[PDB]
RNA sequence: GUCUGGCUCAUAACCAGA
RNA sequence: AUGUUGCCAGCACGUUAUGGUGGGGACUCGUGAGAGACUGCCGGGGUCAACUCGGAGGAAGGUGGGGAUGACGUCAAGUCAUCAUGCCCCUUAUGUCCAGGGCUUCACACAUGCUACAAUGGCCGGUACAAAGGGCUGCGAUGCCGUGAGGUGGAGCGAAUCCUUUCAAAGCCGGUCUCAGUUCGGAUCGGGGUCUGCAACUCGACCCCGUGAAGUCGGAGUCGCUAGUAAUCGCAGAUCAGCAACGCUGCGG
């Protein structure tokens, strides 16, 4: 995992949009295309729609899931069996 | 016997084909087979006359029997195919009923590689 | 004085000769301190053997390069040159033990295609 | 106080004529010298594919080496200075002047 | 050896035992090139076997040696296209080898916990008659003899 | 191998140049003391806002003039396969085959 | 000796016989045999009533072993199964989570060998 | 693969290196700045035959050697030519590039020469066997060549099947290390192809 | 007959043991 | 021949820290030149011929050992993806820029390797010997902070000088384990971190704690190797910000 040192990584292009959708108190899908962001305590009740390389999947955020990235909810292969 | 094919490009049905075709040739094999494969290739320049390839490899027991064929398209390529395997297949038997004709006979009448040699006395025998 | 030298793939053994009694200076160690092995120091003390010389001359000897068993073998043909320049008249002796000659067998190069020096990698027929 | 003239080239005739030159020069202008003491020789070697698709199991072997003299002298007078910079030599070697 | 015979290692006689015998031994009891551990196996058998009997352990080697070198060996030959097991006499070299080997062997499949002990034991039992390889040996000479038929050739 | 990416090779060099010699590498002296204050800075941020191009790891050593970029050397920025072409033609001083 | 419900080996070191309880590896028993003050090297049937206290209760105090561990690492792996990350379905269909190749390798997850 | 470049395998014994300096730091710009040099010169002039190019460097100066079998071919009378050449070499960022134009004694001994006049006959119309036996011929009508080797390969004479044709004269010992083999590739530019000509030239053996 | 070891390209046959 | 950054035998200064230091060619060593193996000699076989066997001398004896060197051609062998190129085809695209993903997908099959199945061993402590190679916006020491990856810091080095530790591991000595799926084996998995990089989710390496799978020497069949070889042990380099390196190319024990 990423360095203490270094912090977090979180894109800024999804940081302000959420800056904005939390500041009125309404939480809209956000159409987001950078997977290596981790997940900030900031983004508890937002509805992200993350690329999976076809489309975006909606990801609904909870406490579980604030430390990880938004790749992993994403599983971009497809496999059904043999 | 089980036998994969190993393809290439667009030829369709040709697995299949080659499979059963080729699948049939173990009770010919006097020995039990540990391997056998086969592949498919297509020449890109239409200026062949023959543009379908086949080979194929067998593991006989250790022994290992390959051929290959060239058609125009691929059931003909998968015929002849067998067709050679069967005839290595024919001349790699080795049983006895294959070699029973090599093994020296008679005494004195004949003469191979193999031969018992004649025994000598020590004085010549005058 | 009389300084001589011994090589055995890799290891440079430097010796110095003086009458004294049978006193072992390796780098300020002694025989048993160094080459703690019997075989070792039995190949370091038979050309002393055969000249039965043993424990009349003092022994001081600089070790560097290889590994114990090359440091003692350039050490035996050190002490065998040292004393074939003492006591000219013994190289019989020593020459037809073979002490007095050096060992041209050095590590053989590895070669590319190849895991070790000779060793193949392995090759599947089927 | 002497001032180290180090020698760097890929042929060895020519470092050994440069540095019998030099010394030749430096005697000369009457300059007290050690020699050209003999330095170990660096190795630099490749390996390379002669093919350019596949087989890897055939390759080839290069090596770069480079042969080095040291040239010390003493008594650094200044006529063997102005001699020492107004040298020319063949371009394969360089002089290192300390 | 398309060519002739080629030409055998002379190894030296062992400095604590002053024996040829004692350091083929070493060599065959060698892994790896590990020769010290192998000289400290077959010291600590031989004066394991010092301490049991009482006496020298070269003579007793040289008897489990004796006792388990063997004569009659079978090889299979091809004569007019046919192959047989044909007894065959044994150079005392050869014999010599497939002794030590033999030891060696059936000493590394013993159950005494440790080589050392699993040698000398089986040492011990070959000068005596009772080891695995003095059986092998009888083997080995019932297939010569059960084969003679086939000595003419 | 293309020109357009022989060419984008450069323009990435340039870019490094010109970005990553002072301004990519400021923020990196900001975040490594644990003392500088990094977190309200935003020199993480601040240095995500730069191009990637900026960013050495984009480069790729490819050969100076065939445009190989696998099989390179650093000591002659060539593709194996040139290399073994000009040192048998004897056009890099000092370079021939090998024996030990 | 019964130790947090463990029988310990009959004749065992005692860093080595403390190995076996489930929470505990070689360090963890090295230090904890270091911090509490037994010896180290002597035998499980040498232990006293109170060493068997002493070390059921500095166990219960700084370490978490035995079921607890178990149901702890159970409900993580089921919490993480649950929240449908990778390693959530990774977990689901028994196949290697760290991004180990599956193409040949990998048959500790797949389990036996099978013929299809 | 069958056999390696003569000059190659010779290089540290008879044959010299066609470039001459030394660089610690800066040998991988020296040799860029060396091809851009050596790619230039070919592109630019190919009436004259361009037989070798050599290149020499100390620090800001640069020193350039090439010989031609028609030095006043590449030079201008007023300059033109060398005007041209130096301008378009200080472009290369040489800083100081000087020149010194030569010409080769012998033209028909020289092995790049003779493959250049193979080819070039090869391209417009000629048959392939009347260039071989014109070139061998002049190539032993000089006093020390001792023997030379002719080969091209390809689609010769416009057919639709790859061919390769050779002959030889005299003596011409490849894996003596030795004797001195001048060798010379170049390759003709046909309607039907490319057609590559080698030529192997030896004049006696070098002792030192 | 049944289990090995030897043997044979493998089963066979033959040899040495339980 | 040759003495520095390399040796130190005889001399002096050394302080524990040692060629460390003044000094010296003596011995190694480094790198230049040269000598030396030529059936040269002897004895015997030989057509008195090639050639062959043995012996002396010698460091080396019979192309000393190992490399580089690969004839005419074969297999329409491989490569239009190093490059070049005839002809055909695309050209508001089969060119070109960007973000994300993929090349890492897995019911299986094949092939090359590494680690094991242990006592000729595992673990702990002490302790001895190499060669070769690399290093400038690179190697990076002493010191300090961590348990450990590592962090801070920067001495000295374009380097026979400094760093890679003064360089190794197998080895030797001592202690313990006592034949068990174990103090073997390490996979898999849970948690916690470090570093590089704009960014380790897909998809990096390493470190710590815990977890402790198969595996009891492997059927038919099959591979490599004739001496410093096989076997085994460690070290280095290229590519390279980092690494999938157990791969490849070398080096020594």
């Not at chain 2, 049939?24 to 087979?33: E, G, W, Y």
């Not at chain 2, 060239?70 to 038997?93: C, K, P, Q």
């Not at chain 6, 191009?53 to 065939?66: A, H, I």
């Not at chain 7, 963890?28 to 068997?52: C, H, P």
């Amino acid at each position: 995992p990423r360095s203490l040192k270094k912090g977090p990584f979180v894109d800024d292009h999804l940081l302000k949009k959420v800056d904005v959708q939390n500041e009125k108190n309404t939480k809209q899908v956000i159409k987001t295309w950078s997977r290596r962001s981790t997940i900030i305590p900031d983004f508890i009740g937002h509805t992200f729609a993350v690329h999976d390389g076809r489309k975006h999947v909606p990801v609904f955020v909870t406490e579980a899931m604030v430390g990880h990235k938004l790749g992993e909810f994403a599983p971009t292969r497809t496999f059904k069996g043999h | 016997m089980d036998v994969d094919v190993s393809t290439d490009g667009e030829l369709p049905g040709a697995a299949e084909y080659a499979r059963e075709k080729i699948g049939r040739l173990s009770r010919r094999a006097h020995r039990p087979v540990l391997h056998a494969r086969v592949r498919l290739t297509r020449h890109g320049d239409p200026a062949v006359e023959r543009p379908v390839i086949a080979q194929a490899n067998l593991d006989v027991n250790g022994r290992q029997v390959r051929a290959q064929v060239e058609g125009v398209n691929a059931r003909e390529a998968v015929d002849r195919l067998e067709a050679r395997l069967r005839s290595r297949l024919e001349r790699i038997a080795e049983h006895w009923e294959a070699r029973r004709g090599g093994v020296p006979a008679e005494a004195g009448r004949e003469w191979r590689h193999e031969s018992e040699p004649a025994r000598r006395p020590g004085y010549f025998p005058r | 004085p009389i300084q001589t030298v011994g090589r055995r793939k890799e290891a440079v053994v430097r010796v110095r000769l003086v009458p004294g009694t049978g006193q072992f200076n390796l780098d300020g160690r002694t025989l048993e301190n160094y080459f703690p092995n019997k075989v070792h120091q039995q190949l370091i003390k038979a050309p002393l053997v055969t000249v039965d010389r043993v424990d009349q001359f003092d022994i001081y000897a600089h070790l560097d390069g290889g590994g114990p068993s090359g440091q003692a073998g350039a050490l035996r043909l050190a002490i065998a040159r040292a004393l074939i320049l003492v006591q000219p008249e013994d190289r019989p002796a020593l020459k037809k033990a073979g002490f007095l000659t050096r060992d041209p067998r050095a590590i053989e190069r590895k070669k590319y295609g190849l895991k070790k020096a000779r060793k193949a990698p392995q090759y599947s027929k089927r | 106080q002497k001032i180290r003239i180090r020698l760097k080239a890929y042929d060895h005739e020519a470092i050994d004529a440069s540095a019998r030159k030099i010394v030749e020069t430096v005697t000369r202008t009457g300059a007290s010298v050690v020699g050209p003491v003999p330095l170990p020789t660096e190795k630099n070697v490749y390996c390379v594919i002669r093919s350019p698709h596949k087989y890897k199991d055939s390759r080839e072997h290069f090596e770069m080496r480079t042969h080095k003299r040291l040239i010390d002298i003493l008594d650094p007078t200044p006529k063997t200075v102005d001699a020492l910079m107004r040298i020319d030599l063949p371009a394969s070697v360089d002089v290192n002047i300390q | 050896p398309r060519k002739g015979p080629a030409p055998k290692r002379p190894l030296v006689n062992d400095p604590v035992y002053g024996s040829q015998l004692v350091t083929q031994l070493v060599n065959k009891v060698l892994l790896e090139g590990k020769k010290s551990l192998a000289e400290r196996i077959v010291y600590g058998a031989l004066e394991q076997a010092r301490e049991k009997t009482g006496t020298d352990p070269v003579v007793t080697l040289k008897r489990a040696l004796d006792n388990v070198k063997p004569a009659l060996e079978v090889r299979s030959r091809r004569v007019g296209g046919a192959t047989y097991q044909v007894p065959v006499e044994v150079r005392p070299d050869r014999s010599t080898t497939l002794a030590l080997r033999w030891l060696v062997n059936f000493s590394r499949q013993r159950r005494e916990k440790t080589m050392v002990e699993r040698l000398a034991n089986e040492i011990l039992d070959a000068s005596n008659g009772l080891g695995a390889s003095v059986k092998r040996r009888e083997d080995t000479h019932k297939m010569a003899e059960a084969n003679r038929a086939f000595a003419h050739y | 191998a293309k020109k357009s990416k022989i060419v984008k090779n450069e323009q990435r060099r340039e870019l490094v140049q010109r970005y990553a010699e002072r301004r990519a590498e400021l923020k990196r002296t900001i975040r490594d003391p644990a003392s500088s204050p990094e977190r309200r800075a935003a020199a993480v941020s601040a240095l995500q806002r730069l191009p990637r191009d900026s960013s050495p790891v984009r480069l790729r050593n490819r050969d100076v003039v065939d445009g190989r970029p696998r099989g390179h050397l650093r000591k002659f920025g060539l593709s194996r396969v040139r290399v073994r072409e000009m040192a048998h033609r004897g056009e890099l001083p000092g370079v021939r085959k090998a024996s030990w | 000796a019964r130790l947090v419900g463990v029988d310990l080996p009959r004749d065992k070191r005692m860093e080595i016989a403390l190995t076996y309880i489930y929470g505990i590896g070689r360090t963890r028993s090295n230090e904890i045999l270091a911090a509490t003050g037994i010896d180290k090297n002597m035998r499980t049937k040498d232990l006293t009533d109170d060493q068997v206290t002493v070390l059921r209760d500095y166990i219960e105090g700084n370490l978490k072993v035995e079921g607890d561990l178990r149901r702890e690492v159970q409900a993580d792996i089921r919490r993480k199964i649950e929240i449908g990350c990778y390693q959530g379905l990774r977990h689901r269909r028994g196949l290697p989570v760290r991004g180990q190749r599956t193409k040949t390798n990998a048959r500790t997850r797949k389990g036996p060998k099978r013929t299809i | 693969g069958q056999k390696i470049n003569p000059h190659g395998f010779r290089l540290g014994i008879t044959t010299e290196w066609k470039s001459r300096w030394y660089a610690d730091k800066q040998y991988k710009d020296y040799v860029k700045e060396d091809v851009a040099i050596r790619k230039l010169l070919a592109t630019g002039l190919e009436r004259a035959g361009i037989a070798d190019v050599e290149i020499e460097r100390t620090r800001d100066r640069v020193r350039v050697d090439i010989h031609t079998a028609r030095p006043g071919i590449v030079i201008g009378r007023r300059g033109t030519e060398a005007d041209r050449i130096r301008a378009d070499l200080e472009k290369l960022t040489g800083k100081q590039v000087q020149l010194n134009i030569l010409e080769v004694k012998n033209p028909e001994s020289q092995a790049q020469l003779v493959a250049q006049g193979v080819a070039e006959q090869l391209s417009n119309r000629v048959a392939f066997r009347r260039a071989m036996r014109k070139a061998i011929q002049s190539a032993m009508r000089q006093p020390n060549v001792k023997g030379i080797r002719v080969q091209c390969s390809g689609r010769l004479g416009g057919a639709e099947m790859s061919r390769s044709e050779f002959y030889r004269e005299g003596r011409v010992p490849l894996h003596t290390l030795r004797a001195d083999i001048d060798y010379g590739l170049y390759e003709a530019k046909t309607t039907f192809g490319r057609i590559g000509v080698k030529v192997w030239i030896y004049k006696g053996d070098i002792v030192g």
